[PDB]
Design a protein around this ligand. Structure first.
Ligand SMILES: Nc1ncnc2c1ncn2[C@@H]1O[C@H](COP(=O)(O)OP(=O)(O)O)[C@@H](O)[C@H]1O
Ligand SMILES: Nc1ncnc2c1ncn2[C@@H]1O[C@H](COP(=O)(O)OP(=O)(O)O)[C@@H](O)[C@H]1O
Ligand SMILES: [Mg+2]
Ligand SMILES: [Mg+2]
Lengths: 303, 303
């Protein structure tokens, strides 16, 4: 038994593998990029996809853009214009894809384009055509981690997941226009419009049969420091699988705990196989609160 | 609406906060350090604690030690002598505590002592007294993150958690001697001995009433690529709360899924309130396997 010798991991490998762990699949890259479009005050967001996002993801917005002088560092880890940690999403994407950014600010004379590998600027940004806002292009996702590339689903399931994410951000963000299409196709698979209510976007993404059966919900509680709004299906609507959109502080989230609560409430009113449609937006800042929601929904179902 | 300006996070803050997130509490620092003692082929491990591990944790082993020339980088991130990622545990601890290491290799002429802040060597290592192996001393845990220091439990609950961890590693590692005491006390609260069987260490840590009621278990399956051994309580033993030790590849782990399976099996044999004692060691390399364990245990309870 002798002592080992300590070496350093190659963190070009470490950083690639961790970035794979964060991103996971094209829908998730797209989720991060959309959130950036919304943070940059965009009112029009367009998504274009080739091969389920494995070949190309392109997202164009009309938001505030990235200043020319900041393109040097925008994809580095822990660089952010905002107050896990801020500044990891584009850095991560850039470690497992070829990223190009085309962007213009109101105060810039023209748009600039820059390309990145592993978080680093490849060359000085170059002026190009383009209007107010930002187009990010993400190519060959996981070209450098074979195991995750093969561990992804077929192109049409991955496209399916992108639709789910974008359609879901579009219900939460009524008034902002969203679209998703496959590259080289002219007709969008999802398209919402700048003057749409929350209910119109539910009708558009989820169909007239759900939109006709919605109950509006809201409750605030200053003592429990939370607010909630959204829409739920009344006791007359039933499908084979529960469609549950959940947003907590404007991020889309999954929650086995709360979907359980609400299912128990609905179990008493809906048929044996069948399930509800749920859209809830919770505003919280940093337990018994999940009683008030179960209570509030049951109250609304009884009414 | 104008464009932001991108700045860099201070990663002295980032690194401190993430390290808090990993470590969480003294029992967990101790878990990481013990595992290092075992990796370094230690047969005698001594733990000493002041104030539940908030003031001092000291762990002495007789393992292979750290070479003098490697003390410079041992607490840096991603430095390891081994093949999330390797090399994060001591780096993390050193970002939220004052770490001192005293260590000797068989080939070194004497032990060397070094002190670290934020992963960096404070001064050149200095020769000192000490035998084969390594003593790590971890002081003032979370002195630099007030919110986690107050979010820790009272000193005696945290000490309680250290006992749990060490007692549990000691059942898995029969033949290796472990002890834990409070600083300045002469009698250990936990002590296992170099010639002890697994059953002796269960008797010692968990008492004669459990050790008298154990069924040995083992199953291998080449097709499902797993092995399992351990000990369980037979249908005659019952306590108010389920004591379940689980090791997968020699790390202690919690598992709501498998503890559920086994509880369902035991529910049929044990009284209404009461629960079993379980020690299982699973060897796996990188679903239907949880059926074989539920099956194998029921089989052993029926027999
Ligand atoms: N669509 C966009 N429009 C304007 N700025 C963007 C856009 N996407 C990214 N950015 C800029 O790049 C930075 C890094 O983004 P990201 O890596 O997601 O970290 P974060 O959003 O936490 O700051 C943002 O703070 C922002 O300044
Ligand atoms: N008790 C110990 N005895 C010998 N070497 C140790 C001990 N603790 C830590 N080390 C050394 O420091 C390195 C860093 O430990 P750690 O930060 O836990 O990362 P890892 O265990 O993944 O290598 C180990 O690879 C090992 O060489
Ligand atoms: Mg972002
Ligand atoms: Mg370790």
């Amino acid at each position: 038994f002798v002592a080992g010798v300590i070496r350093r991991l190659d963190e070009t490998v470490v950083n690639r593998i961790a970035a794979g762990e964060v991103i996971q699949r094209p829908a998730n890259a797209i989720k991060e990029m959309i959130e950036n479009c919304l943070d940059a005050k965009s009112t029009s967001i367009q998504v274009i996809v080739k091969e389920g996002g494995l070949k190309l993801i392109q997202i164009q917005d009309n938001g505030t853009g990235i200043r020319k002088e900041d393109l040097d560092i925008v994809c580095e880890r822990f660089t952010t214009s905002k107050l896990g940690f801020r500044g990891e999403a584009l850095a991560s994407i850039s470690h497992v894809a070829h990223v190009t950014i085309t962007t213009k600010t109101a105060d810039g004379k023209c748009a600039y384009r820059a390309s990145y590998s592993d978080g680093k600027l490849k060359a000085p940004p170059k002026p190009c055509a383009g209007n107010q806002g930002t187009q990010i292009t993400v190519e060959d996702l996981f070209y450098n981690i074979a195991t995750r590339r093969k561990a992804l689903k077929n192109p049409s399931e991955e496209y399916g997941k992108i639709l789910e994410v974008v359609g879901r951000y579009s219900v939460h963000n009524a008034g902002i226009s969203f679209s998703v299409k496959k590259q080289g196709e002219t007709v969008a698979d999802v398209r919402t419009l700048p003057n749409a209510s929350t209910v119109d976007n539910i009708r558009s993404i989820f169909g007239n049969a759900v939109s006709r059966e919605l109950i509006e919900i809201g409750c605030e509680d200053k003592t429990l420091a939370f607010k909630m709004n959204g829409y739920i299906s009344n006791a007359n609507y039933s499908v084979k699988k529960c469609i549950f959109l959940l947003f907590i502080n404007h991020r889309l989230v999954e929650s086995t705990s709360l979907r359980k609560a609400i299912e128990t409430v609905y179990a008493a009113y809906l048929p044996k196989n069948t399930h509800p449609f749920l859209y809830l937006s919770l505003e919280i800042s940093p337990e018994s609160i999940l009683e008030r929601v179960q209570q509030h929904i049951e109250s609304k179902l009884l009414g």
